[PDB]
Amino acid sequence: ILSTASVLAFERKLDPSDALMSAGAWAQRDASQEWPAVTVREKSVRGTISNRLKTKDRDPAKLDASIQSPNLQTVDVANLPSDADTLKVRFTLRVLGGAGTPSACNDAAYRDKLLQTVATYVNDQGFAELARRYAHNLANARFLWRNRVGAEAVEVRINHIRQGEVARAWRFDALAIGLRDFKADAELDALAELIASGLSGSGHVLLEVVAFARIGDGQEVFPSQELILDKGDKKGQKSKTLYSVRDAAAIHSQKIGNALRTIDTWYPDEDGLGPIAVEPYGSVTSQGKAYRQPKQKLDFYTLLDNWVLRDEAPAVEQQHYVIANLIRGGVFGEA
Amino acid sequence: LSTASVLAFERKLDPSDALMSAGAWAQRDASQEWPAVTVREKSVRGTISNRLKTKDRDPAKLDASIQSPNLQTVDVANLPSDADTLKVRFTLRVLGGAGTPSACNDAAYRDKLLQTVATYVNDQGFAELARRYAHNLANARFLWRNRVGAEAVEVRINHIRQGEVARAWRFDALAIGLRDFKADAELDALAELIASGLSGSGHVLLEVVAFARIGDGQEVFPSQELILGQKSKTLYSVRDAAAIHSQKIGNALRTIDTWYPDEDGLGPIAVEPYGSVTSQGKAYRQPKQKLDFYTLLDNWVLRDEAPAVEQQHYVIANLIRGGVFGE
Amino acid sequence: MKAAYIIKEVQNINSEREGTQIEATSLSQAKRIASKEQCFHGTVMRIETVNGLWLAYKEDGKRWVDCQ
């Protein structure tokens, strides 16, 4: 008995908004509400097709006649203004709670055994490790993806807004706090015990997150890119589109949040490759592989089917991976 | 004597579409000029997240499928970066004449059905049903996922005389629970207005406005369309405002059923024949037991075997939502 | 009959680059001789008429996407 429920769907906890980019001077960070938006512009590039060569002809005249024709193109680019050296990135985060309750299910016995399994997690140890692990990915500005690379300073400023007004504030040197180790601070444990109170359904948690990244006058900033359809389909012009909201350059709200759940430091075949994002069959597109295979027995499906059905409770570090997938949300049914 | 092969009831409690707009809280008494929430697109790169069907366990295909993923376009609705409040506004029309079918095929079955519904109304009114519908207007259950994790939800209901406001009501939708039915001296008035509308005394038109502090730039959830960088999600919009379907607002009004032949440890469900919820995937009023709508209707109309007083509210509540009944 | 086409090898779909004129009977013959005469890997082939109207394109190991 006790087959898996053929429908499982969980709503996401930790939902961030799109983050909007602005620009100003680093000594004006305390009055940065009226900083103008980074705009997306256009420019023309041309370059040589210098990709790797198909092995048919080694004759010099072929490559010499190919490089005489250049490649003309129009891209979208985002830069700081030439008098501004600081990028501002601002978003709001909301941490919901009620993590183990599915949004859709079929079996009622599977749903009650799942709720009691997640309750027996939460009562033994709370959300303390996961919230300390999320507060580090807020405290360092990992959500600044390529904007973080090569900055003189990165500042992170976090406000808890219990009304319109701000209940408590935080300021972090985001480069002192590393990108690998989860070392402890008092002011970071305060933010962790706020995120764990939000995840345990205790209070309402809305966080305003502002990150200042000094990169230099006029330098290129990096928003997220859009797909090319409906921007020239039969004869088009633009071949690179950047994400805007109201012609303010922006990062998608799922590329943030991907950076928040970069939690998983428990996956077998590694020594020092760092934390990865929490995913079922824990995988990375850049390395092009799944760090958490089903030929081994460490996936979210293979852990959860033993922790609910057969009641084989895994090692307590895998009980953070499973609860992190349930805070992530998703469609975990047979299809 | 027997059930007519053609029955049709019309719906009472007509809601409209609910249009979504955004502004700032404490600008709520001047929220007539708020900008609408616009549905826009964004690109999505996804990852392999679903269960594999045990012939795709191999690394040689899982690595090739995680190497080149799929790219989608979704429709998304957000608040603006300076607006924290979602305003949702629709009108409700409460008709009355609840037991009369619109299409019928018998004269004796129709006469005995009207006799039975008149017996129901003359014993106790529409007051118990209207209390449970007024409670679903007071809490903002018609805000479906727009209500969970909201800092404050406030509901305002105006009753409209000609174009003028006769009575205005004001409710805190989070203090008024979502899984009870209590009493209050200002919700009794809304319940008896809806009762005087369903019994046929007055003309009742309501204007329902709900506010919800979701947060600056956060995602709001309009109702979703069916799909006719291929697009994965399409949101409902009337002209350019994001909107909610009228039947999903209407669904959240007749979630009043607390009389099950199953366990009452799950809250109210929506009034349906064979009382069912898709999100739990089971029907709580089975025809194995004798408490679905059709068996109770046949026993109460044809052979004069009345159900219990609480199940009569269920049968009348199925007559209020309308439907194509009859064998 | 032998019709004239313009075979182009560009970086991505919305790039402009001066192409090479072929002589082909059908569009399938142009797709065959545009399968070869491609020097690089991560490039997009495009088949056009002599006046600049697109006919088909192919993006780094996919189907020929015809242009209606």
XYZ file of C-alpha atoms in Angstrom:
730
model
C 0.000 0.000 0.000
C 0.811 3.738 0.106
C 1.586 4.662 -3.439
C 2.775 8.201 -4.048
C 0.140 10.845 -4.665
C -0.166 11.257 -8.430
C -0.635 15.021 -8.058
C 1.708 17.095 -5.932
C 2.172 20.822 -6.240
C 3.609 23.245 -3.697
C 3.400 27.012 -3.754
C 6.661 28.892 -3.436
C 7.824 30.488 -0.236
C 10.411 33.284 -0.493
C 8.970 35.181 -3.427
C 11.055 38.185 -4.532
C 10.027 40.915 -6.906
C 11.919 41.990 -10.007
C 14.905 44.087 -8.980
C 15.277 47.488 -10.597
C 18.613 49.113 -11.387
C 19.552 52.717 -10.602
C 22.735 54.783 -10.560
C 24.443 57.426 -8.501
C 27.488 58.361 -6.485
C 28.816 56.246 -3.643
C 28.817 59.094 -1.126
C 25.118 59.703 -1.826
C 23.890 56.240 -0.841
C 21.893 57.476 2.148
C 19.743 59.681 -0.130
C 19.264 57.246 -3.002
C 15.483 57.334 -3.405
C 15.664 59.827 -6.288
C 18.478 58.156 -8.221
C 17.573 57.811 -11.909
C 17.064 54.450 -13.529
C 19.664 52.701 -15.632
C 18.207 52.699 -19.132
C 18.622 50.134 -21.870
C 20.156 51.601 -25.023
C 21.129 50.279 -28.440
C 24.453 50.093 -30.205
C 25.891 48.537 -33.323
C 28.569 45.887 -33.092
C 30.513 44.298 -35.845
C 33.034 41.534 -35.502
C 34.671 38.714 -37.360
C 33.153 35.250 -37.326
C 36.042 33.650 -35.464
C 34.393 30.470 -34.229
C 35.961 27.050 -34.530
C 36.416 25.889 -38.075
C 34.823 22.964 -39.864
C 37.512 20.581 -41.061
C 36.790 20.541 -44.805
C 39.300 23.035 -46.294
C 42.619 24.297 -44.925
C 43.230 26.649 -47.856
C 44.202 30.209 -46.841
C 42.075 31.877 -49.525
C 38.862 30.446 -48.032
C 39.395 31.919 -44.563
C 40.811 35.147 -46.022
C 37.726 35.593 -48.204
C 35.424 34.732 -45.307
C 36.935 37.330 -42.974
C 36.568 40.085 -45.586
C 32.808 40.053 -44.957
C 32.053 41.354 -41.455
C 29.087 40.483 -39.258
C 26.741 43.412 -38.661
C 24.466 43.447 -35.658
C 22.479 45.560 -33.181
C 22.459 44.769 -29.454
C 20.956 46.201 -26.285
C 23.389 47.507 -23.676
C 23.074 48.968 -20.203
C 25.742 51.234 -18.738
C 26.108 53.527 -15.818
C 26.054 57.246 -16.580
C 29.548 58.642 -16.962
C 29.229 60.663 -13.746
C 27.831 57.714 -11.755
C 29.998 54.932 -10.354
C 27.521 53.065 -8.124
C 24.827 50.621 -9.205
C 21.782 50.322 -6.973
C 19.684 47.147 -7.093
C 16.449 47.153 -5.094
C 13.802 44.483 -4.546
C 11.332 43.331 -1.927
C 11.195 39.811 -0.548
C 8.299 38.108 1.152
C 8.720 34.938 3.221
C 5.429 33.098 3.503
C 5.455 30.049 5.754
C 3.292 26.973 5.908
C 5.947 25.173 3.927
C 4.927 21.534 3.991
C 1.288 22.021 3.013
C 0.774 21.168 -0.679
C -1.378 23.215 -2.991
C -2.713 20.158 -4.837
C -2.807 16.464 -3.919
C -4.922 13.333 -4.364
C -4.375 10.936 -1.459
C -5.450 12.097 1.991
C -3.339 9.502 3.803
C -0.246 10.582 1.870
C -1.061 14.197 2.644
C -1.491 13.554 6.365
C 1.689 11.460 6.538
C 3.548 14.212 4.657
C 2.229 16.911 7.000
C 3.206 14.857 10.037
C 6.662 14.185 8.562
C 7.218 17.914 7.990
C 5.842 18.695 11.466
C 8.232 16.138 12.999
C 11.028 17.854 11.109
C 10.071 21.343 12.309
C 9.595 20.323 15.921
C 12.975 18.546 16.234
C 14.988 21.378 14.717
C 13.261 24.429 13.363
C 14.005 26.381 10.225
C 17.209 27.578 11.862
C 19.819 26.064 9.546
C 17.886 26.929 6.378
C 17.195 30.476 7.528
C 20.838 31.021 8.495
C 21.640 29.658 5.069
C 19.213 32.027 3.255
C 20.337 35.081 5.233
C 23.896 34.560 3.982
C 22.741 34.642 0.360
C 20.985 37.895 1.189
C 23.904 39.300 3.186
C 26.431 38.721 0.492
C 24.974 40.119 -2.689
C 24.896 36.845 -4.594
C 21.759 38.114 -6.359
C 24.080 40.627 -7.999
C 25.229 38.017 -10.454
C 27.817 39.507 -12.793
C 27.425 42.986 -11.325
C 29.227 41.709 -8.214
C 32.406 40.670 -10.029
C 35.118 43.275 -9.636
C 33.614 45.882 -7.343
C 35.526 48.084 -4.914
C 32.775 47.592 -2.364
C 29.380 45.949 -2.254
C 26.972 47.207 0.395
C 23.748 45.390 1.297
C 21.006 47.213 3.187
C 17.960 45.320 4.476
C 14.806 46.772 6.048
C 11.968 44.937 7.766
C 8.745 46.796 7.037
C 6.084 45.920 9.620
C 3.840 48.673 8.201
C 4.850 51.209 5.646
C 7.367 52.082 8.373
C 10.624 50.189 8.934
C 10.788 47.949 11.991
C 14.486 47.061 11.989
C 17.421 47.704 9.640
C 20.627 45.910 8.614
C 23.841 46.854 6.796
C 26.365 44.315 5.516
C 29.736 44.508 3.824
C 28.862 41.955 1.165
C 32.478 41.202 0.253
C 33.623 40.579 3.822
C 30.855 38.001 4.131
C 32.144 35.463 1.659
C 30.591 33.580 -1.219
C 31.571 30.134 0.117
C 31.497 29.847 3.921
C 28.489 30.352 6.202
C 30.229 32.038 9.111
C 28.218 33.507 11.950
C 27.481 37.053 13.116
C 25.063 38.482 15.672
C 23.336 40.872 13.260
C 23.113 38.079 10.709
C 21.623 35.657 13.229
C 18.994 38.335 13.913
C 18.017 38.310 10.218
C 18.122 34.511 10.296
C 15.744 34.397 13.250
C 13.445 36.756 11.387
C 13.431 34.540 8.267
C 12.816 31.456 10.430
C 9.895 33.204 12.130
C 8.469 34.006 8.720
C 8.919 30.414 7.543
C 7.323 28.935 10.676
C 4.124 30.889 10.068
C 4.665 33.076 13.120
C 4.662 36.620 11.745
C 4.381 38.591 8.544
C 7.775 39.061 6.904
C 8.340 41.549 4.103
C 11.964 42.571 3.571
C 13.174 45.481 1.457
C 16.624 44.687 0.045
C 18.890 47.384 -1.414
C 22.375 46.572 -2.729
C 24.991 49.148 -3.739
C 27.813 47.987 -6.032
C 30.531 50.558 -6.788
C 31.912 49.549 -10.192
C 33.227 52.745 -11.819
C 32.091 55.591 -14.080
C 30.206 54.513 -17.176
C 30.779 50.794 -16.732
C 28.527 48.137 -18.216
C 25.899 46.708 -15.906
C 24.266 43.357 -16.548
C 20.496 42.943 -16.467
C 18.730 39.775 -17.554
C 18.111 38.899 -21.181
C 14.873 38.240 -23.036
C 13.941 35.795 -25.768
C 14.044 37.045 -29.318
C 10.481 36.264 -30.456
C 8.005 39.119 -31.104
C 11.009 41.447 -31.693
C 11.510 40.768 -35.390
C 10.396 37.367 -36.614
C 10.525 37.295 -40.438
C 12.955 40.162 -41.048
C 14.271 41.664 -37.842
C 16.839 44.106 -36.519
C 17.733 43.529 -32.873
C 19.551 40.376 -31.807
C 19.966 40.964 -28.070
C 17.204 42.258 -25.818
C 17.500 43.265 -22.177
C 14.750 43.118 -19.593
C 13.087 46.397 -18.664
C 9.996 47.272 -16.692
C 9.282 50.951 -17.467
C 12.552 51.493 -19.301
C 14.316 50.779 -16.035
C 16.802 47.946 -16.473
C 15.991 44.945 -14.352
C 16.765 41.373 -13.335
C 14.018 38.751 -13.522
C 12.510 37.712 -10.214
C 13.506 34.093 -10.793
C 17.205 34.764 -11.357
C 16.991 36.348 -7.957
C 15.718 33.580 -5.815
C 17.835 31.203 -7.784
C 20.614 33.064 -5.985
C 18.766 32.887 -2.676
C 18.304 29.112 -2.701
C 21.988 28.467 -3.531
C 22.057 26.448 -0.329
C 22.975 22.888 -1.149
C 26.366 22.063 0.353
C 25.403 18.383 0.803
C 25.806 16.596 -2.481
C 28.143 13.613 -2.775
C 30.772 13.769 -5.526
C 32.645 16.960 -4.637
C 35.365 18.462 -2.485
C 35.216 22.262 -2.819
C 32.908 23.216 -5.673
C 30.757 25.394 -3.390
C 27.021 25.662 -2.744
C 24.598 25.023 -5.595
C 20.948 25.900 -5.997
C 18.364 23.619 -4.427
C 16.749 21.668 -7.267
C 15.282 18.184 -7.558
C 18.039 16.148 -9.212
C 20.383 18.904 -8.088
C 21.815 20.235 -11.292
C 23.587 23.156 -12.915
C 23.251 24.324 -16.490
C 26.713 25.910 -16.732
C 28.539 22.759 -15.645
C 25.968 20.801 -17.644
C 25.532 17.981 -15.148
C 23.377 16.744 -12.292
C 25.352 16.720 -9.034
C 22.578 14.613 -7.492
C 21.855 11.584 -9.717
C 19.143 8.923 -9.422
C 21.712 6.170 -10.013
C 22.819 7.127 -6.533
C 20.145 7.522 -3.886
C 20.322 11.199 -2.976
C 17.590 12.949 -4.978
C 14.584 14.766 -3.618
C 12.278 12.084 -4.989
C 14.375 9.223 -3.656
C 14.789 10.908 -0.271
C 11.153 11.963 0.073
C 9.683 8.590 -0.901
C 11.716 7.032 1.889
C 11.032 9.777 4.413
C 7.239 9.674 3.945
C 6.254 6.221 2.684
C 8.841 3.843 4.151
C 9.590 6.297 7.036
C 13.371 5.986 6.510
C 14.390 9.362 7.911
C 17.664 10.368 6.208
C 20.721 12.043 7.675
C 19.675 15.395 9.118
C 21.539 17.310 6.413
C 19.400 15.659 3.734
C 16.407 16.786 5.782
C 17.490 20.306 4.868
C 17.591 19.518 1.156
C 14.079 18.041 1.241
C 12.583 20.925 3.245
C 14.394 23.360 0.932
C 12.728 21.751 -2.082
C 9.374 22.105 -0.335
C 10.075 25.799 0.346
C 11.055 26.117 -3.326
C 7.752 24.677 -4.527
C 7.068 22.887 -7.742
C 5.193 20.173 -9.621
C 6.277 16.921 -7.956
C 3.649 14.529 -9.319
C 3.839 11.615 -11.719
C 3.671 12.910 -15.291
C -44.837 12.637 -9.658
C -41.578 11.809 -11.435
C -38.523 13.904 -12.281
C -38.804 15.948 -15.475
C -36.260 15.149 -18.171
C -35.568 18.870 -18.704
C -34.813 21.064 -15.707
C -32.768 24.230 -15.754
C -32.225 26.748 -12.997
C -30.621 30.121 -13.499
C -27.895 31.413 -11.268
C -28.715 33.904 -8.608
C -25.761 35.849 -7.173
C -24.346 37.129 -10.463
C -20.820 38.511 -10.028
C -18.915 40.459 -12.649
C -15.271 40.226 -13.600
C -13.021 41.749 -10.945
C -10.603 44.344 -12.221
C -7.281 44.766 -10.447
C -5.595 48.110 -9.844
C -2.743 49.303 -7.676
C -1.866 52.207 -5.473
C -0.668 53.009 -2.010
C -2.378 52.131 1.243
C -3.681 55.221 3.101
C -4.639 56.524 -0.340
C -7.631 54.181 -0.156
C -10.306 56.848 0.262
C -9.198 58.338 -3.077
C -8.672 55.077 -4.953
C -11.024 55.761 -7.855
C -8.192 56.946 -10.107
C -5.732 54.187 -9.411
C -3.791 52.771 -12.354
C -4.735 49.309 -13.477
C -2.379 46.357 -13.129
C -1.030 45.413 -16.548
C -0.200 41.919 -17.743
C 3.270 41.768 -19.286
C 5.697 39.129 -20.531
C 9.028 37.811 -19.376
C 11.294 35.025 -20.496
C 11.927 31.939 -18.394
C 14.683 29.366 -18.614
C 13.480 26.248 -16.842
C 15.162 23.183 -15.430
C 14.376 19.469 -15.424
C 12.336 19.175 -12.249
C 9.693 16.503 -12.853
C 9.767 12.794 -12.115
C 11.523 10.635 -14.667
C 9.734 7.493 -15.737
C 12.498 4.998 -14.783
C 13.702 4.551 -18.369
C 15.290 8.023 -18.189
C 17.324 7.276 -15.056
C 20.512 7.230 -17.140
C 23.126 9.993 -16.806
C 23.708 10.055 -20.581
C 20.225 11.483 -21.213
C 19.810 13.461 -17.983
C 23.041 15.357 -18.706
C 21.965 16.025 -22.290
C 18.582 17.271 -21.087
C 20.081 19.506 -18.410
C 22.660 20.810 -20.903
C 20.185 22.367 -23.368
C 17.034 23.431 -21.463
C 13.726 24.868 -22.651
C 12.914 28.567 -22.828
C 9.424 29.888 -22.233
C 7.490 33.121 -22.251
C 5.074 33.636 -19.398
C 2.563 36.348 -18.699
C 3.137 37.999 -15.330
C 1.283 40.607 -13.313
C 3.137 42.631 -10.699
C 2.427 45.700 -8.707
C 4.432 48.807 -9.580
C 7.621 49.362 -7.633
C 6.068 52.116 -5.490
C 2.558 50.656 -5.068
C 2.027 48.168 -2.250
C -1.752 47.655 -2.348
C -3.868 45.599 -4.734
C -7.378 46.949 -5.228
C -9.940 44.469 -6.545
C -13.416 45.685 -7.489
C -16.499 43.877 -8.820
C -20.278 44.230 -8.572
C -22.626 41.555 -7.256
C -26.263 41.191 -8.275
C -28.616 39.164 -6.061
C -31.700 38.179 -7.999
C -34.307 36.153 -6.181
C -36.984 33.759 -7.312
C -34.689 30.965 -6.253
C -36.856 27.881 -6.639
C -38.449 28.593 -9.998
C -36.866 26.698 -12.901
C -36.340 28.458 -16.196
C -36.865 25.378 -18.354
C -39.097 22.539 -17.281
C -40.777 19.563 -18.860
C -43.528 18.680 -16.349
C -46.390 20.605 -14.813
C -46.879 18.415 -11.733
C -43.174 18.099 -10.931
C -42.785 21.849 -11.404
C -45.772 22.570 -9.156
C -44.548 20.194 -6.449
C -40.999 21.570 -6.668
C -42.332 25.096 -6.192
C -44.509 23.807 -3.342
C -41.445 22.227 -1.681
C -39.252 25.323 -2.057
C -42.076 27.516 -0.758
C -42.366 25.149 2.215
C -38.626 25.584 2.840
C -38.821 29.391 2.639
C -41.952 29.634 4.776
C -40.381 27.495 7.494
C -37.063 29.355 7.753
C -36.007 32.124 5.398
C -32.901 32.585 3.325
C -31.231 33.921 6.485
C -28.918 30.966 7.137
C -27.692 30.815 3.544
C -27.336 34.583 3.295
C -25.316 34.677 6.517
C -22.828 32.272 4.935
C -22.676 34.263 1.683
C -22.251 37.572 3.522
C -19.440 35.961 5.475
C -17.649 35.070 2.240
C -17.993 38.671 1.157
C -16.697 39.969 4.502
C -13.557 37.883 4.408
C -11.956 38.300 1.025
C -12.030 34.689 -0.116
C -12.518 35.890 -3.714
C -8.897 37.030 -3.411
C -7.572 33.529 -3.900
C -3.777 33.557 -3.813
C -3.849 37.347 -3.518
C -4.934 36.879 0.115
C -2.315 34.466 1.470
C 0.615 36.293 3.008
C -1.126 39.659 2.887
C -0.252 42.185 5.552
C -3.801 43.539 5.794
C -6.959 42.902 3.784
C -9.835 45.389 3.943
C -13.194 44.852 2.230
C -15.712 47.613 1.502
C -19.254 46.804 0.346
C -21.583 49.519 -0.945
C -25.278 48.940 -1.562
C -26.431 50.871 -4.627
C -29.888 52.495 -4.730
C -29.939 54.188 -8.128
C -26.329 55.209 -8.475
C -26.220 56.372 -4.882
C -24.827 54.496 -1.905
C -27.565 53.492 0.527
C -25.408 51.671 3.056
C -21.641 51.211 3.126
C -19.934 48.450 5.111
C -16.303 48.120 6.139
C -14.588 44.889 7.183
C -11.172 43.640 8.256
C -10.993 40.447 6.223
C -8.146 38.842 8.168
C -9.786 39.143 11.588
C -12.999 37.648 10.216
C -11.882 34.067 9.812
C -11.816 31.948 6.707
C -12.905 28.712 8.461
C -15.791 29.689 10.745
C -19.162 31.482 10.605
C -19.606 33.822 13.579
C -22.021 36.705 14.210
C -21.510 40.468 14.183
C -23.920 43.387 14.427
C -22.747 44.897 11.129
C -22.493 41.599 9.222
C -26.064 40.714 10.251
C -27.193 43.741 8.233
C -25.356 42.541 5.116
C -26.798 39.067 5.650
C -30.343 40.375 5.866
C -29.859 42.591 2.801
C -28.781 39.500 0.860
C -31.722 37.642 2.438
C -34.167 40.317 1.262
C -32.564 40.058 -2.159
C -32.810 36.272 -2.484
C -36.350 36.082 -1.122
C -37.453 38.626 -3.723
C -38.344 41.678 -1.649
C -35.966 44.363 -2.920
C -33.548 44.934 -5.760
C -30.050 44.306 -4.414
C -26.889 45.392 -6.210
C -23.626 45.384 -4.287
C -20.268 46.991 -5.029
C -17.421 45.030 -3.452
C -13.954 46.571 -3.130
C -11.085 44.679 -1.527
C -7.663 46.098 -0.694
C -4.637 43.946 0.090
C -1.154 45.061 1.159
C 0.955 42.599 -0.791
C 4.131 44.692 -0.999
C 6.030 46.935 -3.424
C 6.448 45.279 -6.799
C 5.205 41.892 -5.605
C 3.364 39.476 -7.841
C -0.401 39.521 -8.025
C -2.315 36.573 -9.430
C -5.032 37.187 -12.023
C -7.070 34.358 -13.387
C -5.420 32.231 -16.026
C -6.493 31.288 -19.558
C -6.087 28.046 -21.464
C -3.390 27.961 -24.139
C -4.872 27.769 -27.619
C 9.915 30.447 -26.641
C 6.381 29.104 -26.873
C 4.119 30.682 -24.280
C 3.514 28.682 -21.099
C 1.045 30.920 -19.269
C -1.623 33.405 -20.320
C -3.371 35.740 -17.922
C -6.893 37.098 -18.193
C -7.267 40.771 -19.052
C -10.475 42.579 -19.999
C -9.080 45.587 -21.873
C -5.614 46.074 -20.398
C -6.327 45.631 -16.685
C -5.510 42.273 -15.180
C -8.746 40.672 -14.068
C -10.335 37.700 -12.332
C -12.949 35.516 -14.069
C -16.496 35.974 -12.817
C -16.910 32.260 -12.147
C -13.873 32.150 -9.878
C -15.258 35.016 -7.821
C -18.587 33.230 -7.873
C -16.944 30.020 -6.688
C -15.506 31.713 -3.618
C -18.973 32.924 -2.585
C -20.771 29.575 -2.370
C -17.956 27.932 -0.403
C -20.469 27.662 2.440
C -20.929 23.892 2.799
C -20.008 22.663 6.283
C -22.319 19.630 6.367
C -20.481 16.591 5.156
C -21.044 12.856 5.222
C -17.252 12.804 5.637
C -14.889 14.342 8.206
C -15.355 18.025 9.106
C -11.631 18.535 9.690
C -11.117 20.329 6.374
C -13.231 23.508 6.426
C -15.972 24.711 4.090
C -16.100 23.531 0.494
C -17.970 24.907 -2.487
C -21.564 23.909 -3.145
C -21.499 21.338 -5.950
C -23.387 18.204 -6.866
C -21.315 15.338 -5.414
C -19.497 17.882 -3.250
C -16.072 18.021 -4.758
C -12.804 19.937 -4.758
C -10.251 19.482 -7.530
C -7.329 20.586 -5.350
C -7.976 17.620 -3.059
C -9.090 15.323 -5.866
C -12.065 13.706 -4.167
C -15.829 14.122 -3.898
C -17.070 14.421 -0.341
C -20.759 13.730 -1.021
C -20.746 10.290 -2.568
C -23.916 8.675 -3.943
C -22.922 5.535 -2.045
C -24.147 7.474 0.964
C -27.438 9.316 0.674
C -26.255 12.929 0.880
C -25.436 14.122 -2.627
C -27.648 16.669 -4.343
C -29.639 14.485 -6.724
C -30.686 11.816 -4.209
C -31.682 14.413 -1.602
C -33.602 16.384 -4.245
C -35.441 13.288 -5.467
C -36.350 12.236 -1.937
C -37.453 15.701 -0.876
C -39.520 16.503 -3.968
C -40.944 13.242 -5.296
C -41.631 10.949 -2.344
C -41.845 13.752 0.256
C -39.042 12.336 2.416
C -37.396 15.490 3.672
C -33.719 15.500 4.642
C -32.406 17.023 7.839
C -32.730 20.776 8.326
C -29.046 21.310 7.564
C -29.125 19.383 4.284
C -32.084 21.435 3.097
C -29.750 24.450 3.119
C -27.403 22.480 0.867
C -30.165 21.534 -1.577
C -31.437 25.118 -1.761
C -27.851 26.349 -2.185
C -27.511 24.098 -5.205
C -30.722 25.594 -6.529
C -29.269 29.096 -6.107
C -26.178 28.388 -8.218
C -28.327 26.975 -11.028
C -27.515 24.139 -13.340
C -28.816 21.592 -15.800
C -30.669 19.102 -13.627
C -33.294 16.538 -14.535
C -33.088 13.082 -16.072
C 15.953 26.175 -64.984
C 18.527 27.146 -62.364
C 17.518 29.793 -59.838
C 19.763 32.198 -57.970
C 19.932 32.321 -54.173
C 22.029 34.095 -51.554
C 23.602 31.835 -48.932
C 24.590 33.678 -45.762
C 26.465 32.457 -42.693
C 25.768 34.736 -39.738
C 26.315 34.579 -35.986
C 22.667 34.635 -34.941
C 19.331 35.007 -36.716
C 19.065 38.807 -36.715
C 22.531 39.524 -38.093
C 23.390 41.128 -41.416
C 26.317 39.845 -43.445
C 27.150 39.888 -47.142
C 26.557 36.435 -48.591
C 27.589 34.321 -51.555
C 25.421 33.767 -54.614
C 24.752 30.185 -55.689
C 22.978 28.570 -58.623
C 20.417 25.997 -57.528
C 17.400 24.298 -59.040
C 15.175 23.903 -55.972
C 15.135 25.231 -52.426
C 16.036 21.745 -51.195
C 19.142 21.849 -53.392
C 19.994 25.190 -51.786
C 19.507 23.646 -48.341
C 21.799 20.761 -49.299
C 24.568 23.032 -50.595
C 24.050 25.337 -47.610
C 24.472 22.331 -45.336
C 27.981 22.336 -46.721
C 29.838 25.555 -47.645
C 29.635 26.403 -43.930
C 32.980 27.061 -42.326
C 32.208 27.502 -38.634
C 30.367 25.747 -35.808
C 28.121 28.057 -33.830
C 26.697 29.939 -36.801
C 23.348 30.293 -38.531
C 22.828 29.601 -42.211
C 20.272 31.706 -44.048
C 18.895 31.375 -47.579
C 17.609 34.487 -49.331
C 16.536 35.665 -52.756
C 18.578 38.107 -54.816
C 16.543 41.087 -53.544
C 16.759 40.331 -49.819
C 13.691 38.257 -48.968
C 14.364 35.454 -46.491
C 13.427 31.894 -47.389
C 14.792 29.544 -44.712
C 17.333 29.396 -41.921
C 19.078 26.833 -39.726
C 20.571 27.485 -36.275
C 23.447 25.194 -35.206
C 22.095 21.683 -35.546
C 18.326 22.133 -35.835
C 15.701 21.927 -38.539
C 15.527 24.350 -41.405
C 12.988 26.889 -40.159
C 11.129 27.954 -43.280
C 10.108 31.605 -43.623
C 6.500 31.904 -44.790
